[PDB]
């Protein structure tokens, strides 16, 4: 379940075997130095040895830094946790800011435990269940077949109860798990003898299973560290895993959990898969948060943190002095900064073509040039938004291609920041100013 989002066009970093960024691949365009740095960080993360490094992504708005993070996440792929949060999420009311940050960090450490399970899988030949009226004793036995073997089993009380709950019928194909005891109906073998109800709802036949009737299979349990913390924090913590409201979990629990996980790793019971945490608009964070971040990176079970910021020199929140990137020098000294540059014209034109391809919008060459010129003049995001509006205008025109006139109409109807600013400056009397004065009447 997904829709075409602002970063839906990028499927990775698009790098070669020698970490040399391809000029355009996997959706990403240009930004070669930053993509190379991202690839180096990617290899460091995939190695899994370096812990608690902090990396900062800096540069002007719209220069793809959040796209760079999305590409990094796509390169990580599944089975490696990636927690993307914003600075605005940290300031909560039910948790201390350091508690919220701790919960965020522990969401970024993944534990994989592999287990081997014995599985029975069959076609049902017949099932029998002898239960005494006004009595609790029940007797049953099951016959279950495979293409190469058939066997009978005599059923215990719990197995009888489970099979009765599942309403197994002989024309079912089903698997039996000897440990869990759950029964899953895989499909149907033949028809229901044409009873006068449920006539043709079983047409989707399934093939008989083949091989040993009782076969061993492996199951992998992927769980984050934060989930384990919530599970072991209190008795009601499992409900809190979905409801929230976990409370401010005691630190001693965290210390014991860290020791236990360290023992599990050294024992080979569990495999730890650290991931990457991405913070958006970090400058929103408080100096108390950055103070906690300084120590939090030093921990051995910490992920690798990447921070997006663009405000340049600005007053750090909680203090009365400006700081080089909105962040204190305490955090700035311990972090490696990767930079992003403004885009050339050709990079913008190819980004626009890629976005139109992703949105399934067919742009004519002259229309593509006009849209690129508009994007170069004002902003890449503005032209990106204009693409879909032009497509809708073309559809309204009953044409299968987007022409230049559609783009012109979209420009005329919908404004950019500069045009709105100019129209405001010309007509300041029609809007409410900071001093609370405005003319509502026209005479």
């Amino acid at each position: 379940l997904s829709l075409i989002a602002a970063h839906s066009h990028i499927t990775g970093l698009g790098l070669d075997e020698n970490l040399q960024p391809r000029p355009t691949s996997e959706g990403m365009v240009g930004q070669l130095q930053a993509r190379r740095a991202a690839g180096v960080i990617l290899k460091m993360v995939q190695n899994g040895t370096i812990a608690g490094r902090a990396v900062l992504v800096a540069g002007p708005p719209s220069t793809g830094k959040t796209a760079l993070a999305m590409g990094v996440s796509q390169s990580l792929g599944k089975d490696v946790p990636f927690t993307a949060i914003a600075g605005s999420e940290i300031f909560s009311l039910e948790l201390s800011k350091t508690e919220a940050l701790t919960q965020a960090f522990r969401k970024s450490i993944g534990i994989k435990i592999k287990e081997e399970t014995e599985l029975i899988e069959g076609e049902v030949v017949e099932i029998q269940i002898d239960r005494s009226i006004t009595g609790g004793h029940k007797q049953g036995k099951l016959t279950i077949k495979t293409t190469d073997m058939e066997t009978i089993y005599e059923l215990g009380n719990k197995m009888i109860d489970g099979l009765t709950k599942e309403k197994v019928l002989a024309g079912d194909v089903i698997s039996i798990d000897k440990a869990s005891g759950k029964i899953t109906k895989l499909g149907r073998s033949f028809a229901r003898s044409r009873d006068y109800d449920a006539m043709g709802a079983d047409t989707r036949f399934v093939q008989c299973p083949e091989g040993e009737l009782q076969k061993r299979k492996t199951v992998v349990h992927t769980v984050s560290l934060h989930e384990i913390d919530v599970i072991n924090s209190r008795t009601q913590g499992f409900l809190a895993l979905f409801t929230g409201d976990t409370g401010e979990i005691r630190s001693e629990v965290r210390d014991q959990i860290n020791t236990k996980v360290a023992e599990w790793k050294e024992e080979g019971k569990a495999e730890i898969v650290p991931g990457v945490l991405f913070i958006d608009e970090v400058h929103m964070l408080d100096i108390e948060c950055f103070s906690f971040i300084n120590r939090a990176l030093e921990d051995e079970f910490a992920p690798i943190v990447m921070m997006a910021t663009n405000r340049g020199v600005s007053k750090t929140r909680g203090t009365n002095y400006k700081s080089p990137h909105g962040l204190p020098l305490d955090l700035l000294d311990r972090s490696i900064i990767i930079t992003t540059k403004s885009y050339n014209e050709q990079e913008i034109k190819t980004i626009l073509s890629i976005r139109a391809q992703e949105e399934e919008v067919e742009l004519s060459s002259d229309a593509l040039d006009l849209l690129t010129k508009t994007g170069v003049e004002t902003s890449l995001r503005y032209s990106s938004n204009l693409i879909s509006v032009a497509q809708q205008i073309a559809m309204k025109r009953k044409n299968n291609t987007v022409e230049v006139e559609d783009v012109k109409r979209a420009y005329l109807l919908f404004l950019d920041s500069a045009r709105s600013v100019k129209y405001v400056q010309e007509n300041e009397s029609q809007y409410i100013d900071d001093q609370g004065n405005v003319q509502i009447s026209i005479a």
């Binding site: 201390s96 209190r234 700035l332």
Partner: protein, 426 residues
């Protein structure tokens, strides 16, 4: 194989028996005077005599305050409690800052006790109720058989655990906990297909008794005496799901817990292990926290709290006109002993880089290591420290083991420093 962090190479203070510190021991380079002071403090802590002592590690950034704290924690050993903190942690939302601070204070004081565990473990042979009525259950073990009378709470636990006759059960007398360990092996062939898990009949006698040693803290006792924490009864469930948030533990409860601990020590069943509390980013603390910390230092039962600060002549948070040596008001400053930590010259920076490379399993050419050391001298030591991993990644991409100068120059061109970014912004 193994993961590496900021202080993976820090194994100890490396101080001799006389207390003098060698130039290079325990992974430390230089800072001999601070190491000697820290060793004296370690002796003071190990004496287990004074309470509430506080010292301040004052120095610039990237100078070795957290390294010294972690080295003290390692040297003292895992027996003692060492609790590192940032001041930001104190600013809780559920309870006041005083409650969090006092909880951290008593959490840093350790208690080691001896307890006898009474254990019963059996397969079940009869289930008779004494009629909520006591239950009569028979149990056997490899050496013999026994029949037991259990309280109604245990009866509720057994009923809610879906124990059958012929199940094997574990009862811990101290807590009254009933755990179904599984089904006896003797009934393995009772059916062909059931969800039963079969366990063998427990070895030995039905009743066993063993003496363990368990480590607890004063805060653990406070929590135990404050709210219900375990149990398999619905009464326990309701008792613990009520009032879930933390509460401001009163001074009376702490006094009673202290009296109990004194009684245990007098009886010899318990021993005290005073520990250390470390607070970092102490400048984050408001004037109220410092004001109460003044009171806690005079308390008769307090750990050896150490303070780290790295700001000078900065105003105290909360206050608007108090200029203090390190953001610490003069009232608390008089309660502290200040240990000065000094910056690093070029040779020590080079040695530190060499040791870090050796620890993280990297191979560095002498010229490349010299270039890295001189660029760390130019900008910052930590900058050189974090560049090591990208350099190692770059070397692997060239199908080459040892780090060369080209990798270092490429890493510098790829990743920039804070000063370079500030210049770019300008």
């Amino acid at each position: 194989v193994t993961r590496t962090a900021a202080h993976t190479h820090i194994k100890g203070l490396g101080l001799d028996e006389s207390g003098v510190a060698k130039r290079v021991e325990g992974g430390f380079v230089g800072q001999i005077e601070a190491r000697e002071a820290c060793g004296v403090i370690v002796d003071l802590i190990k004496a287990k005599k004074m309470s509430g002592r506080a010292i301040l590690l004052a120095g610039g950034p990237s100078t070795g305050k957290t390294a010294l704290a972690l080295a003290i924690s390692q040297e003292l050993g895992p027996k003692v409690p060492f609790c590192p903190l940032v001041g930001s942690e104190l600013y809780s939302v559920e309870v006041k800052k005083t409650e969090t601070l006092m909880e951290n204070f008593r959490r840093a004081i350790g208690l080691r006790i001896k307890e006898t565990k009474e254990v019963y473990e059996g397969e079940v042979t009869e289930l008779t109720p004494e009629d909520i009525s006591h239950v009569i259950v028979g149990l056997k073990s490899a050496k013999g058989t026994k029949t037991l009378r259990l309280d109604p709470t245990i009866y509720e636990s057994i009923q809610r655990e879906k124990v059958s006759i012929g199940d094997v059960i574990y009862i811990e007398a101290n807590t009254g906990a009933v755990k179904r360990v599984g089904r006896s092996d003797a009934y393995a062939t009772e059916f062909d297909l059931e969800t039963e898990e079969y366990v063998p009949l427990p070895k030995g006698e039905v009743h066993k008794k063993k003496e363990i040693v368990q480590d607890v803290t004063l805060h653990d006792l406070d929590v135990a005496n404050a709210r219900p924490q375990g149990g398999q009864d619905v009464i326990s469930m309701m008792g613990q799901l009520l009032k879930p948030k933390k509460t401001e533990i009163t001074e009376k409860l702490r006094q009673e817990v202290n009296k109990v601990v004194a009684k245990y020590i007098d009886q010899g069943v318990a021993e005290l292990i005073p520990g250390v509390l470390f607070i970092d980013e102490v400048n984050m603390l408001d004037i109220e926290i410092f004001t109460y910390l003044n009171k806690a230092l005079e308390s008769n039962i307090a750990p050896v709290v150490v303070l780290a600060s790295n700001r000078g002549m900065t105003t105290v948070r909360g206050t608007e006109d108090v200029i203090s040596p390190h953001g610490v008001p003069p009232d608390l400053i008089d309660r502290l002993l200040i240990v000065r930590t000094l910056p690093y010259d070029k040779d020590e920076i080079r040695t530190i880089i060499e040791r870090r490379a050796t620890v993280e399993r990297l191979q560095v050419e002498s010229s490349a290591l010299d270039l890295l050391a001189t660029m760390g001298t130019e900008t910052s030591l930590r900058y050189a420290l974090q560049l090591l991993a990208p350099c190692g990644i770059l070397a692997q991409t060239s199908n080459r083991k040892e780090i060369v100068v080209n990798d270092v120059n490429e890493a510098k061109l790829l990743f920039l420093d804070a000063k370079r970014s500030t210049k770019i912004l300008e």
